[PDB]
């Protein structure tokens, strides 16, 4: 019936961490290789994703108890949750009005077609669009949005994690907060938490499809050369 | 006293190869990560150099007898001559008027300071500037400029070359052409060929200094992550 001085603390850190790592103007975008509308969008989106990974790392490092994990694990979690966290955070820029990520003028408004010119199929882009919409329809409070990201990241069931007990512990602690927060601060949240955990499962397959279509790219040098070192390292197999 | 039907042929291929691989407008430059004036120029120049390597490869593949070399050698030569060929071809964009490479508007005019913001020292940039000037003062015919590049590339004394006999053969054949061409087509070229071979030696040390300052970068991830896969592969040690 009332948040605790430690649960308030975690929410405060997470919300700040997100503000510290997510520009709502997308001003850094000019720094990317320009968009071209084969695979004309690959350089830009690769830049976009590489940049995002950095932001996702900055966020993670501020998640409570994350720093205390082994370098090995922090990497295991980041590598496997990378793309998911990116899909989650991109919801702030997605919009139902025109079914696209609107990160700026005509140049930075990303529609499903643009991503096609990055080597991904409309087939596996549909679930993404569908996922963004449902997430958008949840009208998540910043706290829940922020908590969902941190919970997603601290998933214990990722290829590579060692101490999956300390990680499961951290995660379902976060989960408590989300439930607690929703239950006492979000009117009509009766069903929300379940719906939110639904998203995580959605993300897994969304992650899966991507990791496949990415291997294609990563194997064709004419395309892999368009990627950034960070991307290649994060979505690479070399552990 | 008169060029031969085979020496004319080689000059024709080389000159075309260069036209095919060197835009005099530098229109592709917009595609690079924008210039910022630490290490603000690194992303742009890295893009610039990565792009150039591709052009240098396109040129090499058209050098007579180059394709017939082993993939192993073509790589051995390209890796070791990469930066030199780039320094040579950049002379077309360098200008004594303002002692810089002028590849476009204010954004693409590269002065020595800009390169400092890419992790290189003014100390080892001086010989480059000095080298460009002397080369510029030679007022090379396109043929000689083009021949010098091909000769530089086909140097037999590079770390990695196997069949250094077939390579030395190709090179001093090219050399003949340069001498022959200069001697019958370039009035006042009495001394030129020697001066041109001087440049090659200059290039070696210019290459050396760079390979050092590059290892620095390549070892600091915050910087190496700013490079492109192609650059990392070409200036890498992994043979």
């Amino acid at each position: 019936h009332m948040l605790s001085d430690e649960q308030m603390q975690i929410i405060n850190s997470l919300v700040e961490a997100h503000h510290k790592t997510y520009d709502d103007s997308y001003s850094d975008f000019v720094r990317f290789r320009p968009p071209v509308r084969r695979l004309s969008m690959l350089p830009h989106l690769a830049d976009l994703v590489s940049y995002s990974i950095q932001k996702v790392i900055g966020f993670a490092k501020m998640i409570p108890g994350f720093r205390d994990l082994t370098a090995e694990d922090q990497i295991a979690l980041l590598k496997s949750s990378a793309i998911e966290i990116i899909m989650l955070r991109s919801n702030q820029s997605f919009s139902l009005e025109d079914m696209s990520w609107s990160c700026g003028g005509p140049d930075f408004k990303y529609c499903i077609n643009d991503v096609t010119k990055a080597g991904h199929t409309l087939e596996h882009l549909e679930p993404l669009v569908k996922f963004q919409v449902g997430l958008k329809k949840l009208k998540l409070h910043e706290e829940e949005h922020v908590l969902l990201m941190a919970i997603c990241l601290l998933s214990p069931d990722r290829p590579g994690v060692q101490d999956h007990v300390r990680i499961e512990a951290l995660q379902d602690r976060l989960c408590d907060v989300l439930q607690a927060y929703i239950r006492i601060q979000h009117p009509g949240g009766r069903l929300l938490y379940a719906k939110m955990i639904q998203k995580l499962a959605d993300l897994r397959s969304l992650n899966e499809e991507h990791s496949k279509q990415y291997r294609s790219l990563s194997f064709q040098p004419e395309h892999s050369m368009q990627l950034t070192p960070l991307v290649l390292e994060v979505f690479g197999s070399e552990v | 006293h008169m060029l031969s039907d085979e020496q004319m042929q080689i000059i024709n291929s080389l000159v075309e190869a260069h036209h095919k691989t060197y835009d005099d407008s530098y229109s592709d430059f917009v595609r690079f990560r924008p210039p910022v004036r630490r290490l603000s120029m690194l992303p742009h120049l890295a893009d610039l150099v990565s792009y150039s390597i591709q052009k240098v490869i396109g040129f090499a593949k058209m050098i007579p007898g180059f394709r017939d070399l082993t993939a192993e050698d073509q790589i051995a030569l390209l890796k070791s001559s990469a930066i030199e060929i780039i320094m040579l071809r950049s002379n077309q964009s360098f200008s004594l008027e303002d002692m810089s490479w002028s590849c476009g508007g204010p954004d693409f005019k590269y002065c020595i300071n800009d390169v400092t913001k890419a992790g290189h020292t003014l100390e080892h940039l001086e010989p480059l500037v000095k080298f460009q000037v002397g080369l510029k003062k030679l007022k090379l015919h396109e043929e000689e400029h083009v021949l010098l590049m091909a000769i530089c590339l086909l140097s037999p004394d590079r770390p990695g070359v196997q069949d250094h006999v077939r390579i030395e053969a190709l090179q001093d054949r090219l050399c003949d052409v340069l001498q022959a061409y200069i001697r019958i087509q370039h009035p006042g070229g009495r001394l030129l060929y020697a001066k041109m071979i001087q440049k090659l030696a200059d290039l070696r040390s210019l290459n050396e200094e760079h390979s050092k300052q590059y290892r620095s970068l390549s070892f600091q991830p915050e910087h190496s992550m700013q490079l492109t896969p192609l650059v990392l592969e070409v200036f890498g040690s992994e043979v």
Binding site: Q54, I57, K61, A71, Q74, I75, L78, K79, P229, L230, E233, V234, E238, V239 | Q220, P221, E222, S224, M225
Partner: peptide, 10 residues
């Protein structure tokens, strides 16, 4: 390996 990720994780 993961030179870059290590670096970025302070």
């Amino acid at each position: 390996r993961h030179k870059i990720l290590h670096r970025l994780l302070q």
